[PDB]
């Protein structure tokens, strides 16, 4: 049985309905009861049972979480959205021996769109002494998660040379932070004059370019 | 009902690892114990379940060959053995107890299995200096193994605006993370900024000055 | 009107076409006892009553023969025979207002269950306890009427339903209300399937020497067999003789 | 349906008080009339009910002895006589008409009965001067009887940030309260502030100037 | 009949459900109907009938107020609670002749916890010539009401000598205010040097001392 | 008690007053089989059994002769004849807690 988990990326503000919908290839219904189950995983924590069966709630589960559905279609709803609900929600089947979990829905709270603070870090001198160069493009306090970073080395797009690290949603700020590291050899780094970062985001009316010459 | 697992086992490719799950709070002779696999930041794949009272093991088709499940009712401990470890096997394995007609119902913490050919290496820490409102600076930790590295500013004297990005495994098999902070432009002249990095596996405690 | 003062209209001297009733899907319940709705067109009724009122939805089931409940016990009772129909449709939009609709009333308290098709509009203060009321509302003295309190948001059960109960009288007596069912020319000496004003049989219709009085409309011989009938158009008398049957 | 009562009766301990409830908007002859007691800032206690048509009075067990109820259909007026007034009887008594199968249904304003051996007196005002941003000042009115007291600042020209705490009775049986206000410290030396206190029973109108 | 009214002090924000529960020692239902009734009283106004019977609504009662229950337990719910619902709610039984009212529930609109602004005032000189000395401690703009005021005269705790007055909830700020007046004779007041007011409140991680020297 | 372990009490050697059934307002379903609800005050019974339990509302229908469902089939089954009365009332306010 293959479980398809519609929307797996859901951003809803506090106090609003949030629906995660799991559809099964085959009927999970057997012996009359339903065997579709919902798990919650807080970052840094093991998965915890929320809904055993289609509707029955697990131990110590608030009334906010409600599971419904039958046959091949089920849904999990959290109307009184709270700060403690930011987690990863999985749908799982117990009808057949090979237990299959859903893709997983990452539920996060929503806030107003903010523009990214774009910063550029040239590599340190001692790094050039080590024969390596890493140039950093930084996006501070930007929402939503969607963001495009482009490295321009003397007006040339680079591909397969950048690594992006994104922090989780802040507990209070609720705004993301992104870092992009461009790694090159020292000889190759010293061969081009200008290094620029292109940031594309929903909060900007146009892509933002921040550049610096070598030295 | 609480379950206790092993802690963060590392192995070379092709090796085998034995992992222990210690039941607590129930008979351990009335509930089948399940084992599940989870890659970091990925989905869940149910590996297989063992019945403690009668040693009946049933495995997922993918894990039938490389996984062995055993139980010990005398010490109330289940064991999972992974053989022929590869890079695809590095993950966060979970132990679970049967309950409420759900296969995995009561999970226990989580054990990180790391399969790699690399070795314990010390982090290299480089100052990301401010460029010549709010200015930005930081430190970059590159080529360390294994995770994690604790990074702070002025031994925890600065916490506001400190972003410690998660580490990324490079093609070389090592980890790197950038810890950055935004500071007032006026503070560049007088305020001194130092980044403190701690790597317990390499036992390195290193402090670097960052200046414009 | 409210259920306690249910409004009765006496339908008489009309051609009633019930097709519009069961054809329309607006009505929620169309339960007919003693008659089939699809056959309502063919019948002729001695007299028709239409008792209309407004009730709560969950109490619609109480409008039926042999049913008990507050509405049945104290407000509106249907006889066990009840050759008729009950048509109830939801009217939440019409009978619910912003705030509350308190015009409609129902009788909480009555000393005894009211007789079938009885109406009690008396608002005398009911005496629940031992102490006589003497007309003052007190601890055990209550006004017998309670407002439904219809609000725009309510459950299907609590939302108002308008109910119309059509009581038919089906008998050999002269019929006023009839279905359309056209008409046909009369034939005398031939075995036919006559349908005089609802009566149905098979026999020849000879001229009758029998002397009918002006109020008489149909004749029965010994053993109570309909052997004479006055047609409702010509106002003439016809003797019915069943056409020949015999062994072979 | 409107009911009107007497207003603010005060009596020394041991006295008797008669309150009148004037009915309007209905027959007054077909509805029983209930009387309920409410201690200030407390729950409601039902005193007792009377039938106007037949003078059949039924009282609560606690209030059977010290209370009596009469009715006069001639003027459409109900009456209560409280006898042997003591300190515990000081309260806001309410007159209600019976309706909707509820004993007390349609209530009318409320008559305050104050049992106290004290006498009418004038307020004594003392300036709570600001301590030497936003500072605070005010006046304290003490040793006045009875309620109420009217307190204003600069003849109503200072209404933002003013808090007039409810009066509390002291051991002597008199009333005291502090009326305070917060003002920016920039106006401490510039704007003169005066609290106006009006006590009608003593006819005392006092303007007190508060200064640092 | 004794009516016990659970929670009698409820704080709920605008648009949030508020449930006030009334339980009875004996059965209140009789003759097939229910007799428990819910009254509302705004400050400075006589109580008015909201719910006559278990569920029927009184005259001019908005649909927000819903009464439910039977047997020995009843409940009153206000789902879309509005700012004009700050009042006192009573439950009253009509089954037996002595009509009993519940303890009463004070309904207040909820808001975020605010730190108390704590001020002190020595007695006025004119009051000192009168032979009385009242030291006043003020707590301005704090929520909730739970706050302990302790008087320290030369590091000696006083009891039974201070009166605390609490104002009603502000219409706009929705923050309580408290005053604590400590009254002393002139001779007793003038025998000590240091007078302090210690305030304990939820918005404070530690109790705050506001102290002053006489002179 | 729970429906599976339904609690049974024997009523015998006592005079029974059924007014509490007619006076109470809580009772939602008052269905009698083989006897009439109003005539229980004029009948003599050799022995009475008063079973009691808590059920889900949608399952109240299953407490009746000749009925099928989870409760009837596995928890509490009534005989086909069943001269007796079933009285069920809502208890949401009492049997529901926070959580
Ligand atoms: C009845 O009405 C029809 C149609 O107008 C008419 O032809 C017929 O003559 C009427 N009946 C009598 C007895 O006149």
Numbering used by the authors:
A (entry chain E), E (entry chain G): 22 to 236
B (entry chain D), D (entry chain F): 21 to 152, 158 to 237
C (entry chain B): 348 to 595
F (entry chain A): 348 to 446
What does the paper say about this structure?
The SARS-CoV-2 surface spike glycoprotein (S) mediates entry into target cells and is a primary target of neutralizing antibodies. SARS-CoV-2 spike is a trimer in the pre-fusion form, consisting of three copies of S1 and S2 subunits. The S1 subunit is composed of an N-terminal domain (NTD) and a C-terminal receptor-binding domain (RBD) that recognizes the host angiotensin-converting enzyme 2 (ACE2) receptor on the cell surface. Spike RBD is flexible, moving between “up” and “down” conformations but only binds to ACE2 in the up conformation.
We then generated Fab fragments of the lead clones and determined the cryo-EM structures of Clone 2 or 6 Fabs in complex with the ectodomain of SARS-CoV-2 spike trimer (S trimer) at ~3 Å resolution. Clone 6 Fab binds to S trimer in three states, one with all three RBDs down (26% of all complexes), one with 1 RBD up (43%) and one with two RBDs up (31%). The additional contact is achieved by the CDRL1 loop of Clone 6 Fab that protrudes in between the two neighboring down-RBDs, along with the framework region 3 (FWR3) of the Fab that interacts with a nearby side surface of the adjacent down-RBD (left two panels). In addition, in all complexes with two up/one down-RBDs and the Clone 6 Fab complex with two down/one up-RBDs, a down-RBD-binding Fab contacts the side surface of an adjacent up-RBD through another conserved interface mainly involving the CDRL1 loop of the Fabs, further stabilizing the conformation of the adjacent up-RBDs. The three CDRH loops of Clone 6 Fab engage spike RBD predominantly through hydrophobic interactions (upper left), with the CDRH3 loop also engaging RBD through modest electrostatic interactions (upper right). CDRL1 and CDRL3 of Clone 2 Fab primarily contact the epitopes at RBD right ridge and the CDRL2 loop engages RBD central groove, whereas CDRL3, CDRL1, and CDRL2 of Clone 6 Fab complement with the RBD right ridge, central groove, and left shoulder, respectively, together covering the top surface of the RBD. Based on our cryo-EM analysis, Clone 6 Fab binds to spike trimer preferentially with at least one RBD down and effectively skews the spike trimer towards pre-fusion states. Besides making two neighboring down-RBDs inaccessible for ACE2 binding, a down-RBD-binding Clone 6 Fab can also interact with an adjacent up-RBD through a quaternary epitope located at the sidewall of the up-RBD (right), which clashes with ACE2 binding (right), thereby directly blocking ACE2 access to two RBDs simultaneously. This bipartite binding mode presumably is more stable than the single binding mode with the up-RBD alone, explaining why no spike trimer with all three RBDs open was detected when complexed with Clone 6 Fab.
